[PDB]
Every structure is written in structure tokens, then in C-alpha cells.
Amino acid sequence: ADPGHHHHHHGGCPSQCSCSGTTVDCRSKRHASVPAGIPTNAQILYLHDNQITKLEPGVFDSLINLKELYLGSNQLGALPVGVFDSLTQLTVLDLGTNQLTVLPSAVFDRLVHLKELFMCCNKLTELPRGIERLTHLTHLALDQNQLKSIPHGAFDRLSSLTHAYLFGNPWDCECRDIMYLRNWVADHTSIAMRWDGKAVNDPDSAKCAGTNTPVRAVTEASTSPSKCP
Ligand SMILES: [Mg+2]
Numbered sequence: 660a661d662p663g664h665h666h667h668h669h670g671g672c673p674s675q676c677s678c679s680g681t682t683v684d685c686r687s688k689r690h691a692s693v694p695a696g697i698p699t700n701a702q703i704l705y706l707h708d709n710q711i712t713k714l715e716p717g718v719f720d721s722l723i724n725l726k727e728l729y730l731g732s733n734q735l736g737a738l739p740v741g742v743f744d745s746l747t748q749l750t751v752l753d754l755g756t757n758q759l760t761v762l763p764s765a766v767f768d769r770l771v772h773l774k775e776l777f778m779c780c781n782k783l784t785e786l787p788r789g790i791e792r793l794t795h796l797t798h799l800a801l802d803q804n805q806l807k808s809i810p811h812g813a814f815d816r817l818s819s820l821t822h823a824y825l826f827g828n829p830w831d832c833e834c835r836d837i838m839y840l841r842n843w844v845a846d847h848t849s850i851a852m853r854w855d856g857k858a859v860n861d862p863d864s865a866k867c868a869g870t871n872t873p874v875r876a877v878t879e880a881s882t883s884p885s886k887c888p
Contacts, residue, residue: 660679660682673695673697676694681700682704683705686705687707688709690710692715706733707729709732712735714742715739723748726748728749730753738762741763742766744768751773755778765789774795774797783801801828809840814847832881833881834883834884834886841876844874845875851875
């Protein structure tokens with residue numbers, strides 16, 4: 660797939676990247692921004708393990724054939740409105756290990772066919788809503804954030820989920836609103852995963868803040884509405 664030259668691309672291959680077929684690999688090369696001149700036939704784009712602190716609006720608009728986008732292990736503190744809107748063929752998106760605190764409300768809306776969404780190891784304090792409408796998701800990773808609860812009904816349209824990673828969040832099990840997540844895990848133990856170089860089925864991966872007991876085992880009697888924020 661790498662022909663040993665860069666003649667297949669009108670703009671050549673971006674500096675400090677490698678190009679192989681429709682794969683553009685810019686990993687681990689101290690990039691502080693997305694490199695210019697990424698080939699528009701690109702299907703897989705590796706931008707992970709760099710020092711990207713921000714994305715310019717529109718930076719990906721030309722990459723209409725992109726299937727997989729890896730932005731993990733950068734220093735993203737925010738995302739621009741609409742930054743993924745052109746990527747309507749995208750099936751894998753990795754935003755893990757950044758510094759994201761909030762996301763634009765509609766940031767995932769045009770990724771109607773997304774299959775795998777990885778957002779571990781950020782600073783998220785609430786579920787990005789409308790992950791709710793990503794009905795083709797098989798993989799959802801929210802582990803090691805600061806999530807306290809899941810809005811009632813948030814996962815109910817995700818009928819293709821096979822792998823959910825929720826480990827390492829301070830789930831607020833004293834608050835009676837936890838019961839949606841409690842019941843959802845108990846109903847979906849088969850898809851409760853933790854990662855150890857492979858997917859491990861572990862229904863106790865989601866645990867309560869403080870007590871570290873399994874979220875799925877919470878009793879409604881132990882909860883209270885007045886312990887909610
Ligand atoms: Mg040429």
C-alpha cells in the first residue's frame with residue numbers, strides 16, 4: 660500500500676507523516692496542529708500522541724471519505740462547532756486521553772453511521788447528549804471521566820451496542836437518579852466491558868463513588884432524591 664514514493668498525492672504526503680494507500684499516519688511526531696495537505700482520499704487518519712491543543716474550524720471538511728479518525732493522547736481542551744460534520748462516512752472516532760470538559764451540543768449529530776466512539780480519560784462531567792442518537796454504535800468508551808450519572812433513557816436507542824466501557828467514573832449512587840444506569844447495567848451485563856489489552860466482560864466495571872460497590876447492585880431503597888445535586 661506504500662508504493663515507496665508520494666507521487667499518488669497531488670499535494671504529496673504531509674511532513675512528519677507517512678502515507679500508505681488511504682492511510683495517513685501522523686502519530687507521535689510532535690504535531691501542534693493538524694498538518695496541512697492531508698490527501699482527500701484518506702480513509703484512516705492517525706493524529707494521536709501529538710501536542711495538538713486545538714482544532715481549527717473546518718480543518719477536516721475536505722476529508723469526506725474518512726472512515727477512522729484517531730485524536731487520542733493530545734491536549735484538546737475544546738472542539739470547534741461542526742468540526743466533524745463533513746465526515747459522514749466515519750465509523751471510528753477516538754478522542755480519548757485529552758482534556759475535554761464539554762463538547763459542542765451537536766458535535767456528533769452528522770455522524771449517523773458511527774460504530775465506535777472512544778472518549779476515555781478526559782474531564783467530562785456529563786454525558787454528551789445525542790450520543791443518544793448514534794444508533795449504530797457497537798462500542799462506547801466513557802471510562803475514566805468524572806461522570807456522576809446517566810440521564811434517564813439515554814442508552815435506550817443504542818440497540819447495536821456490544822461493548823460499553825464505564826469504569827473509573829464517580830457514579831453517584833446515593834442519588835435516586837442512578838437507578839436508570841443501575842437497571843441498564845443489570846439488563847445489559849453482556850455488554851459491560853473493561854479493557855485489559857482486550858475486552859473483558861465485567862459487569863462490576865461501573866462502581867459507586869466512595870464505596871466502590873457495583874452500580875448494578877444498588878437498591879432503590881438505599882437511594883434518596885435529596886442526595887441529588
Ligand atoms: Mg505529482
